[PDB]
Amino acid sequence: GIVEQCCTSICSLYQLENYCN
């Protein structure tokens, strides 16, 4: 749910840069 906790809530850029791929 990268979009869930991020769109339906808040998240951390750290886990966001983990998608660099």
Please return the burial class of 11, using the count of CB atoms within 10 Å of its CB with bins 0-12, 13-18 and 19+. Answer: middle
Which residues here bind another protein, judged by CB under 8 A? Answer: 1-3, 6-7, 10-13, 16-17, 19-21
Q: How far is the CB of 4 from another protein (least distance, A)?
A: 10
Q: How far is the CB of 1 from another protein (least distance, A)?
A: 8
**Cβ 6 to another protein, closest distance in Å?**
4
Dihedral Cα 17, 1, 11, 14, nearest 10 deg:
-20
